[PDB]
Ligand binder design. Sequence first.
Ligand SMILES: O=C(O)CCC(=O)C(=O)O
Ligand SMILES: O=C(O)CCC(=O)C(=O)O
Lengths: 402, 402
Amino acid sequence: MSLSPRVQSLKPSKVMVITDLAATLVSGVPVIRLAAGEPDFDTPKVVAEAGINAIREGFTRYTLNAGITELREAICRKLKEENGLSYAPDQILVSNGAKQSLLQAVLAVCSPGDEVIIPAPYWVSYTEQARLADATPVVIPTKISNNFLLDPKDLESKLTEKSRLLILCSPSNPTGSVYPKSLLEEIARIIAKHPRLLVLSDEIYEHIIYAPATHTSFASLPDMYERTLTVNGFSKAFAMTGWRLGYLAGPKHIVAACSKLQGQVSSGASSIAQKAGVAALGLGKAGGETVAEMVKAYRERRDFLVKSLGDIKGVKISEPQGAFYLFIDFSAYYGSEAEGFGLINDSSSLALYFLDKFQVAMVPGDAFGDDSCIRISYATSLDVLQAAVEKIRKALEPLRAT
Amino acid sequence: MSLSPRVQSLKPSKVMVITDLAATLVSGVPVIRLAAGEPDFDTPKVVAEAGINAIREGFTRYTLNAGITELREAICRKLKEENGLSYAPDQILVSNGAKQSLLQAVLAVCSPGDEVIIPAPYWVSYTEQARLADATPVVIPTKISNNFLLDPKDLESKLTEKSRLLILCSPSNPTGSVYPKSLLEEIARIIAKHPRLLVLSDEIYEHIIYAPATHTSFASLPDMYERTLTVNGFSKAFAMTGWRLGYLAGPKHIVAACSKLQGQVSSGASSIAQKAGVAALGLGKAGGETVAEMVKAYRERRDFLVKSLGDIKGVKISEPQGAFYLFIDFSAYYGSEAEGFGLINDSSSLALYFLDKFQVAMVPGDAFGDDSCIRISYATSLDVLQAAVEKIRKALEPLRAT
Ligand SMILES: O=C(O)CCC(=O)C(=O)O
Ligand SMILES: O=C(O)CCC(=O)C(=O)O
């Protein structure tokens, strides 16, 4: 009955657990679902059509494991036009989603004992992927008064000789924060003084961004091109959740080793999805009006929640600059009791209270390494969001702040 | 410039290397391509249509990571109807292809130092996937006079306390051999006396089988259900190479741990591919007439090559019982010299000679752990095969046997 130590010490993704729990409950139990971050739009018409055309034209046989040339060349043009980055097509590795991209990158560059520096709140997979490579997660807490942005001084103090990989998610999952160029530059100068330290730049939410914030690719900073693994994809910006199409861009020697690894553990992205990705990149800079319409809806949802929830006593919010998540501080309510439920002690019991007693499904902050908050996804309709706020207010009424 | 020890010691899949080499050469250089094993048929009409319908009906948003219920239930019915196996839907884990299925299975059950028993000739990824889990490959050579089938006595001798996983590929890649029930039973009784030993049963080529041979699922043998991880898929039988749809069936506790792992490192199979898989399973027992037509073509190609190549001096062949590979013994020609090329010393130089001087691309046996042979894929037309044989004859003419 035994299992490997790597897998048995692995922690289930609470994002997926709660999501599937809410789905299954939706039996015949109506639950407001704000856990997993999945765009509530159809794949854009021309993208879907390219996928259909791929099938109809029999584009279902062997394709290059690393990705078809047509897609990798289109990805190089995107990186240059949108991010100012110069890559050759063999510096691109196309995978089945960004989760696989990140894993292969970590396995490729992290030796046993190496330290992976992960700012909190973090996306749930960063720590677990680190452990899978026999690497040691080095978590750096951030503060809500600082938009959950990394403080350079904290970075420096935690650097050792074993420091190998720094993970930079911008715009962030779960906080929605966007690293300004100013801060990236300071981090860069720190990185530059540590020959062994590489940077993983997770830019999947790049186009989900709200003015005046701007996205700055870390590979674009002075001396950082040689240090940076750029991870990006299609699912969030183009509503291609079921397609699964991610990619990695980076230094030749690293990308070549990830491609070798992928060749032994994966078949690569589907040929059908890759054709769809080509058409998605064909929509123009930043996905054009297609993606702009979607961003405009996200922005309207953001503003509704931020004003609605921020008014509430003992609720603290950082107005997000991108993505589609709110990382809300309800910690003031910890220590109080809700009749019929019990004590609200932390983010997990609070979320469980929201779910059991008010049928709203959110994800507790402890899954992202910050127990002071709970994450809401607002890739859902405005009416759902209105109903969710009404329930959150009612839920917090019998509780006590601080 | 450094990389992890796991990845730098990883060996590139020569199957993919030669395949991409031949493709790229096909510039404007005509090469007979018989390396990678990819069906030369369109995805069946109703399967392709289900994929198109999935896209058109907007089935592109969140799906359960482990696989949609509809597909996992259909997979359970297949396993019962075709293989005599009883699984619950939560004993099925749907992945992006069988390569990922196998990796997660290995990472889940193999602790560092555990030994993975791999009969040779083997599929190229088994040893490398073992190393990725910090496990130790234990290769057992087989003999061509014995249809490259495992000898129980050799299995017993190599068993230690560190023995954790035995990998059984039937019908085999690369040899095309099919394990009879008789032999599986003897192996089973050996397995049964070693509490820690599990079995990975790779049955992806199950329906590509030529009478009188029959496929016997290892999980069906006495006391083996609790010991067996069954890996299967869609790409080979249903010509779904670009779809990427594999699955694992096994004991609940193991499958649950693989599902947890998959949740942190992958997004799972595309939603579009999963709908296509449902329709594929809907074709009936063994894929019905659809798959039967394809098997009939493979069988005709097998018979042509086996008679054509077997006549040639110093060429030894085992008539395959399934899959679509020939593992041909040219070793008699080793030690001879070909003017304009040089010495033919082993399977790699021989293959290189075929490729450079006669534009036929095959894969040397050393990639499968047996340097005495070279592998040919006959998932190509009869005319290509006829041309390949004509070139192989001409190539061997100036060489010397034994
Ligand atoms: O699974 C993904 O890749 C995106 C969805 C996600 O992880 C999240 O909701 O944070
Ligand atoms: O890559 C696959 O999964 C099947 C093709 C293959 O590996 C082979 O030709 O042996």
